[PDB]
Amino acid sequence: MEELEQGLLMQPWAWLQLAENSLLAKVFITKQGYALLVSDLQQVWHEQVDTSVVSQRAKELNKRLTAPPAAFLCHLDNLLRPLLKDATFSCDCVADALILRVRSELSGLPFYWNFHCMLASPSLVSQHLIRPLMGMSLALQCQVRELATLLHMKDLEIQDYQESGATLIRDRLKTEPFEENSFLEQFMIEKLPEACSIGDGKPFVMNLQDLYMAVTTQ
Amino acid sequence: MEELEQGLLMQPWAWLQLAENSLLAKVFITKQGYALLVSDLQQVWHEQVDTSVVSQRAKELNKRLTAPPAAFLCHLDNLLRPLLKEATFSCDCVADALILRVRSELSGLPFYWNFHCMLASPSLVSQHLIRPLMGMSLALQCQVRELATLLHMKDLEIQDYQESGATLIRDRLKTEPFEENSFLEQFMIEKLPEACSIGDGKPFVMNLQDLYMAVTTQ
Amino acid sequence: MEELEQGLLMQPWAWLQLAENSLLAKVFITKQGYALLVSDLQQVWHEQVDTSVVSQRAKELNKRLTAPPAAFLCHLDNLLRPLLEATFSCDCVADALILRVRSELSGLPFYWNFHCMLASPSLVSQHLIRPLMGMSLALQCQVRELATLLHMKDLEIQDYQESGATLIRDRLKTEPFEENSFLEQFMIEKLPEACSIGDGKPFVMNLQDLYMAVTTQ
Amino acid sequence: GSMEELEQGLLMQPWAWLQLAENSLLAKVFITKQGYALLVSDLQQVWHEQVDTSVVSQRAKELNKRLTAPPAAFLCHLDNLLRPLPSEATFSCDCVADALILRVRSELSGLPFYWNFHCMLASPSLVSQHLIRPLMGMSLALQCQVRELATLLHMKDLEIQDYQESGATLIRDRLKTEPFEENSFLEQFMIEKLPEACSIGDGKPFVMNLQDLYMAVTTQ
Amino acid sequence: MERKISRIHLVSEPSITHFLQVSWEKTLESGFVITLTDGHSAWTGTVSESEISQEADDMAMEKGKYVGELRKALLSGAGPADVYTFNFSKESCYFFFEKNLKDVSFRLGSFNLEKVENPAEVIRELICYCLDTIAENQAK
Amino acid sequence: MERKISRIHLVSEPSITHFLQVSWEKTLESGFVITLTDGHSAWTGTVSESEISQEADDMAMEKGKYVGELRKALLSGAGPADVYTFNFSKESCYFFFEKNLKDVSFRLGSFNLEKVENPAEVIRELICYCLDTIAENQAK
Amino acid sequence: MERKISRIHLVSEPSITHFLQVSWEKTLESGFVITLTDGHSAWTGTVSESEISQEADDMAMEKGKYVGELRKALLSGAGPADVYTFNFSKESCYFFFEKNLKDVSFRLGSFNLEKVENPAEVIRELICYCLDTIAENQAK
Amino acid sequence: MERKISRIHLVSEPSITHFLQVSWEKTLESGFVITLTDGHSAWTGTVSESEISQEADDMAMEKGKYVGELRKALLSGAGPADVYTFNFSKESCYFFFEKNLKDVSFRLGSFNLEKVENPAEVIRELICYCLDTIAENQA
């Protein structure tokens, strides 16, 4: 199985909906089993599973049916685009275990399942949650660096103009000369308060989750 | 007691080293007890202490050094201060707990303390560790954003100097129009590999502490 | 599981060595798990355990490997059956003692990390003290039976050297046994040495029969 | 006064048997005008407390309304108590968490005398110092003595054996002892004597037979 | 350059007798290239000395004991005893060669194999080698 | 059981060196089985003794001479001189091995094969026999 | 032989300023004989190099810096900054020496002493001594 | 304030070498105070200027003859010649010193030494005196 963890890392995070709460997570599925990582912005849960249990519990909660593994896993695969595919979702918190129940209808015919979660190992939170985040920070910094230098280059062209003249056209459209500090200070006053919106990680997932994808495989 | 935890959330992160193992952490000290949060990237540790244990344990590494409680933390805090912002360090770990080894001097004399930390609380690895970082990341995205729009504006200006004013430039300071996607890509190919490089947590501290607190206090 | 403790008490103590430090301990092993008891003569350390964790940490480190736990416990059962032989190292942090055992086992590497907590007091009783106390008093009683025996032979030659009217070759003419003077001469000349802890060696060598016989008692 | 100073001695102090309502603990105690050192147990767990003048004065004034007084005085008072070895004495003891509380009440000029003793569990190091090491040592030494008795016994044997193979006989036909056997003594003793002898009980057969040796092994 | 080959039993198709060629320079430790083919298709991979000493350190065996076991595991230089067992997923490349002995299954190594685009050429290759090999071997 | 193998330069693919295996019981004329391979796919055909005498007549050579010509043609026992070339059409299946010498196309021995079901199996078979072989000839 | 002395203030009796004599051989480190007195009775003790180096380890200092402390302390050569306090219990013939400065109250040493039978005898001893000196210090 | 110290051999105890401290003001003869110890116990007495003029008339020498006399016999400034024998009895408290300078005896000295109580505080007072003195004199 094991390599699922691999794939898990490669997979990005996203946003979901529930009655008491609403969580983030990433997941990977093969015809062998699954790997799962959820979190409510305070604590992190995780579960890996093989055939045996898939089958057993599968039959348990589904008095109705009786399928094989493969299909099964594949069907959870059909959690269509994070939001919004069209499937009902419920969540319960008890013990060091997050129970996560699910209802869907493959061919106008209801299906019932539930996830047994424990609290995620520290090391794991370090692989999926911490290190990659920090990396994102540093990198982003560098990006801002190259953008600053580009800004000042442009500034050196338009300043190769300004002294020897030319006069422009739509007088106003010229932007102020670039200062690197007098920007970081009016950014960490005007724009920083909301720039770091924890909220519910929903802001993170887009831009930031993509850059994350960029990060993990590294 | 409470206050301790409080102050801790303020104090940023820095670099160390002992037996070569290099750890990072945050610490808060006032008379009455300290707040400690260590980590070796891939496991978090933590220890909160009041007067009682200072007194008890402090005379067990020094079976004769009978001292006032609130004086210990005076010294400790004082050396940690010159190091981060005369000593000897070591570190060991087993099972669930990290034992930190402070083998220093005071003045001409020897002093010996042992930190008994245990895997840091989940909610702490939440408040101290992640939420803040995610914030740094979203905010940085904001910075690359505004730097992008400004780059495009300067672009409109230089392209009002180089088309409408019908003038020319020395061609040595002639920059290419800014393409944020071509940028992001060329950078995530050429510069991405190691910009994020965690290292020993060192590239992190020196570079992004200002922001760490720019978000962790907010 | 519970039986591990019974057999554990059923076992005498022995000596070891690992990177200069030299611990003492007792242990018991059946196919479920084991029960262990290590100490350096100041604080005692203790770890009881089953199959779950022997397979878990029997994992961490030794990755590649995959086996039934009852095989592990058997392996080490062979290692430590006759260390009482690959190598060892000992680490000490927190309340705990981490015991690193390194060995081959038919080719491929393989080693374990005993996670030791600080022994339960009640245990220190069951195994350590009570038994020891018993040993002491027993030895005393031996000293008394031996006292009366000695005085009895003294009676025999005190019937040969007066009432029989005979003399000796005086090469084997021994002294009238005084219990008290013997106690002082021994507690001045022989006591400073007869009660030598040192490393716990003079114990496992001279008293494991008394101990084993008293803890089954 | 480096407190511990106490401890020390404490050691060159020996145990001794008590009695209470539900239990009958053992312990050892050391008292100077500075403070005191205390080590109790019921044969299952070990307890300990060392106290400085201050707390003595405080807690002491608490429990005792009737009177009040100086630090030193108090401590003096306590050393007044032998252990029959026959006078007043009222004892009790109750266990909470792992820090048992020992209740005392006695005369002292018709103004009785109460106390709240505060015993925690004894750090390992210590239960090794007072308890383990000295005990094991005892074991060893006693072994040795049994040895010297084996050799002395065999000496007597050689004497009577150069007496009975060369012309001497008994007057009282009954003082004829047996040659000697160490192995047989150890076995007959280990089936006919061991099951008694080695009896824990109330720590009583201990402080009444092996005290001198204990101390001799705690001072050395 | 040098070479040696052996027959194995993939524990995915214990009926189809797959085959394994191994080619190197001087000592097997000087890096080596490996090939596994069933007759129809053909897989190949590269394991440098770097990862020989790397896996040798990972297991904690000397570099010379690990090289011995990899000269009894991938050069059919296995004694009459040891029960090695190889494993390949034709879907996940990762071919891991495990050892098995006395109720305990372990392992011994694992590598990433590619899928050559011309199985045929490689086959005619090995074959030719064998030809010249028995010609020159009945020449000795 | 008897066998032998060699290599021929197919005329449709002068770059790809094809391979030829012929098995029989005692004398080659007793009737034989022929198999041609390019490495991936395989072809298999029979040649009965009556078509041996038959073709030996069509040509007009004695059964002892013609037999020499195929023991020099299809069993790599070719004298340093004689220059045989072989041709097959995976479309027609008609395989003619012809002899070439003095600037004239001579010809000789023809027959029809067919693309088999299990090229993999065939190849594994050959490789196995070659293993057993070289083994046998270092043991000799 | 060698001799030096000092005036202290045991903390059991700040009224009765007691007195302290140290006599060694070559260097204090060689081991030393110490004696402390009040006027009426006299107390004596030995501290061989054995326990000097012993304690010097116990305190994880250079076996030197230790003895330097037993020079500012037990030879009144004290730097005017460090403050030391001695203590003795006449009922507990143990003399323990606490080095002090900015309580806490760190530490430094402590060994059992005793009482000689002729406190007088000794007294007269040292009186003689110092007579001899200041005398051969007004001749010098 | 002035003073000096030294040892002597009592005839009652030629075993124990007792000790003497004599303090004055300006000159010996302005009057003085005296102290005699054994190590353990300590004795002391007064001596006016009057009783010294009287001892000088009771002997028959000048005030200045007798003076040089105690200048030497006592303050350890005796001669090579000059052979003194000192005498105390603690059943007496009376102290009298017998000068001697040929066969045999003469005397000279004799006044009431009463016995201090705190040998101790004396012994320490002395010793401090020698401390500060020996230091002052290596200075």
d(CA G49, CA D100): 45
d(CA B33, CA G33): 45
G46 shares contact with chain B (CB less than 8 Å): no
SS3 E28: coil
Instruction: For residue G129, give the chain H residue with the closest CA.
Output: H130
D9 shares contact with chain G (CB less than 8 Å): yes
Token pair 């029979």 is found at F46
Tokens of D78: 């306590």
Instruction: For residue C90, give the chain B residue with the closest CA.
Output: B94
Tokens of C3: 């039986």
Tokens of C213: 């016989």
Residues B20 and B211: beta-carbon distance below 8 Å:
no
Min Cα–Cα distance to chain H from G121, Å = 7
SS3 H54: helix
Tokens of C165: 């009217």
Option in G59, G103, G105 nearest B110 (CB): G59
- Please state the separation of Cα G83 from the chain's center in Å: 15
Min Cα–Cα distance to chain A from B145, Å = 9
d(CA A119, CA A46): 6
Min Cα–Cα distance to chain F from E7, Å = 9
Instruction: For residue F134, give the chain E residue with the closest CA.
Output: E134
CB contact set of D39 (below 8 Å; sequence gap of 6+): D10, D27, D28, D29, D46, D47, D48, D122, D126, D130
According to DSSP, residue G136 is labeled T
Identity of the amino acid at H65:
K
Neighbours of A123 (CB within 10 A): 12
d(CA A133, CA B191): 17
Q: ∠ CA(G38), CA(G42), CA(G43), 5° rounding?
A: 110
CB contact set of C109 (below 8 Å; sequence gap of 6+): C62, E59, E60, E61
d(CA H123, CA E58): 79
Option in D5, D9, D32 nearest G96 (CB): D5
Fold entry, domain C1-135: Dna Repair Protein Xrcc4; Chain: A, domain 1 (2.170.210)
d(CA D37, CA D79): 11
F119 shares contact with chain E (CB less than 8 Å): yes
F83, F80, F74, F128: which is closest to F104 by C-alpha?
F83
Cβ separation of B63 and D4 shorter than 8 Å? Answer: yes
Neighbours of H74 (CB within 10 A): 22
Token pair 């669930």 is found at B96
Residues E111 and E52: beta-carbon distance below 8 Å:
no
Q: What are phi and psi of E80, to 5 degrees?
A: -75, -5
Cβ separation of F134 and E131 shorter than 8 Å? Answer: no
Tokens of H8: 């002597």
Token pair 């402590």 is found at G110
Identity of the amino acid at B138:
L
Breaks (C-N over 2.5 A) in chain B follow: 85
- Please state the separation of Cα F68 from the chain's center in Å: 14
d(CA H42, CA G30): 38
According to DSSP, residue G102 is labeled S
Cβ separation of G94 and D5 shorter than 8 Å? Answer: yes
Token pair 């907010």 is found at B218
Min Cα–Cα distance to chain B from C117, Å = 10
| Helix D211-219 with D133-164: angle, nearest 10 deg | 120
Beta-bridged to residue A66, according to DSSP, are none
D1, D11, D5, D45: which is closest to D25 by C-alpha?
D45
SS3 A96: coil
Tokens of D18: 């008590």
Contacts of D2 in chain B (CB under 8 A): 64, 66
Residues H84 and H100: beta-carbon distance below 8 Å:
yes
Residues A163 and B167: beta-carbon distance below 8 Å:
no
Our answer on whether H and D touch (3+ beta-carbon pairs < 8 Å) is: no
Cβ separation of D5 and G92 shorter than 8 Å? Answer: yes
Residues E93 and E107: beta-carbon distance below 8 Å:
no
Give the right CATH number for C136-217 from 1.10.287.450, 3.30.870.10, 1.10.10.10, 2.60.40.10: 1.10.287.450
G98 shares contact with chain H (CB less than 8 Å): no
Option in G61, G65, G104 nearest B65 (CB): G104
Most B CBs within 10 Å: which of C61, C93, C113, as the mutation test of the B interface?
A: C93
| Span B137-218 CATH architecture | Orthogonal Bundle (1.10)
F27 shares contact with chain E (CB less than 8 Å): no
Cβ separation of B141 and A44 shorter than 8 Å? Answer: no
The H or E element spanning position C50 is none
Residues G6 and G24: beta-carbon distance below 8 Å:
no
CB contact set of D53 (below 8 Å; sequence gap of 6+): D33, D34, D35, D71, D72
Whats the size of chain H, residue-wise? 139
HEC secondary structure over chain F: CEEEEEEECCCCCCCCCEEEEEEECCCHHHCEEEEEECCCCEEEEEECHHHHHHHHHHHCCCHHHHHHHHHCCCCCCCCCCCEEEEECCCCCCEEEEEEECCCCECCCEEEECCECCCHHHHHHHHHHHHHHHHHHHHHC
SS3 A17: coil
d(CA B213, CA B136): 9
Option in G5, G7, G127 nearest H19 (CB): G127
Min Cα–Cα distance to chain G from H123, Å = 5
Whats the size of chain D, residue-wise? 220
Token pair 């090579």 is found at H80
The H or E element spanning position B58 is helix B51-58
d(CA B138, CA A207): 9
E92 shares contact with chain F (CB less than 8 Å): no
Class of domain B1-136: mainly beta
Our answer on whether G and D touch (3+ beta-carbon pairs < 8 Å) is: yes
Q: What are phi and psi of D31, to 5 degrees?
A: -130, 115
Instruction: For residue G10, give the chain D residue with the closest CA.
Output: D1
Min Cα–Cα distance to chain G from B134, Å = 45
Task: Give, in order, the Cα–Cα distances in Å from E26 to each of A2, A6, B176.
Answer: 36, 36, 54
B10, B5, B14, B48: which is closest to B208 by C-alpha?
B14
Residues A151 and A178: beta-carbon distance below 8 Å:
yes
Q: What are phi and psi of D207, to 5 degrees?
A: -65, -10
Instruction: For residue C97, give the chain B residue with the closest CA.
Output: B94
Tokens of B148: 């992008």
* Overall number of domains in chain E: 1
d(CA D26, CA D203): 7
Cβ separation of C91 and B94 shorter than 8 Å? Answer: yes
E48, E54, E43, E52: which is closest to E113 by C-alpha?
E43
Buried b (16+ CB within 10 A) or exposed e, H21-36: bbebeeebbebbebbb
Residues E90 and E12: beta-carbon distance below 8 Å:
yes
Please give the residue range of the domain that contains residue H127. Answer: 1-139
Our answer on whether C and E touch (3+ beta-carbon pairs < 8 Å) is: yes
CB contact set of F107 (below 8 Å; sequence gap of 6+): F96, F98, F99
Cβ separation of C115 and B95 shorter than 8 Å? Answer: yes
Residues F100 and F106: beta-carbon distance below 8 Å:
yes
Option in C66, C71, C109 nearest E61 (CB): C109
Residues A13 and A209: beta-carbon distance below 8 Å:
yes
Cβ separation of F19 and E123 shorter than 8 Å? Answer: no
Min Cα–Cα distance to chain D from G71, Å = 21
DSSP calls for C94-136: TTEEEEEEEE-SSSS-EEEEEEEEE--HHHIIIIIHHHHHHHH
Contacts of C96 in chain B (CB under 8 A): 94-95, 97
CB contact set of G40 (below 8 Å; sequence gap of 6+): G119, H40, H119, H120, H123
Identity of the amino acid at E53:
S
Contacts of G91 in chain D (CB under 8 A): 32
The phi-psi region of residue E112 (left if phi > 0; otherwise alpha if psi is between -120 and 50; otherwise beta) is beta
**E2-7 and E19-24 beta bridge pairing:** antiparallel
Class of domain D139-220: mainly alpha
Using omega within 30 degrees of 0 as the cis cutoff, is the peptide bond preceding H131 cis?
no
d(CA C138, CA C129): 14
The CATH code of the domain that includes G76 is 2.170.210.10
Most C CBs within 10 Å: which of B38, B43, B94, as the mutation test of the C interface?
A: B94
Q: What are phi and psi of A54, to 5 degrees?
A: -45, -55
DSSP calls for G31-91: EEEEEEE-SSSEEEEEEEHHHHHHHHHHTTS-HHHHHHHHHHSTTS---TT-EEEEEEETT
Cβ separation of G98 and D2 shorter than 8 Å? Answer: yes
Contacts of D8 in chain G (CB under 8 A): 94
Domain extents in chain B: 1-136, 137-218
Chains sharing 3 or more CB pairs under 8 A with chain D:
B, C, G
Q: What is the CA radius of gyration of chain H?
A: 15
According to DSSP, residue B127 is labeled I
HEC secondary structure over chain D: CCHHHHHHHHCCCCCCECCCCCCCCEEEEEECCCEEEEEEECCCCEEEEEEEHHHHHHHHHHHCCCCCCCHHHHHHHHHCCCCCCCCCCEEEEECCCCCCEEEEEECCCCCCEEEEEECEECCHHHHHHHHHHHHHHHHHHHHHHHHHHHHHHHHHHHHHHHHHCCCCCCCCCCCCCCCCCHHHHHHHHHHHCCCCCCCCCCCHHHHCCCHHHHHHHHHC
Which long-range contacts does D109-113 make (Cβ < 8 Å, 24+ apart)? Answer: D111/D66, D111/D67, D112/D66, D113/D64, D113/D77
Instruction: For residue G97, give the chain B residue with the closest CA.
Output: B64
d(CA B13, CA B16): 10
Contacts of E54 in chain C (CB under 8 A): none
D2 shares contact with chain G (CB less than 8 Å): yes
Q: Structure solved using which method?
A: X-ray
Contacts of B62 in chain G (CB under 8 A): 107
Q: What is the largest CA-CA distance in chain G?
A: 47
Cβ separation of D136 and C203 shorter than 8 Å? Answer: yes
Tokens of D12: 């060159």
Q: What is the CA radius of gyration of chain G?
A: 15
Contacts of D5 in chain G (CB under 8 A): 89, 92, 94, 96, 110
The H or E element spanning position E95 is strand E95-101
Tokens of H36: 């005699």
Min Cα–Cα distance to chain C from D41, Å = 11
d(CA B134, CA C209): 66
Identity of the amino acid at B2:
E
Neighbours of F96 (CB within 10 A): 15
- D1-138: CATH number: 2.170.210.10
Min Cα–Cα distance to chain H from G11, Å = 17
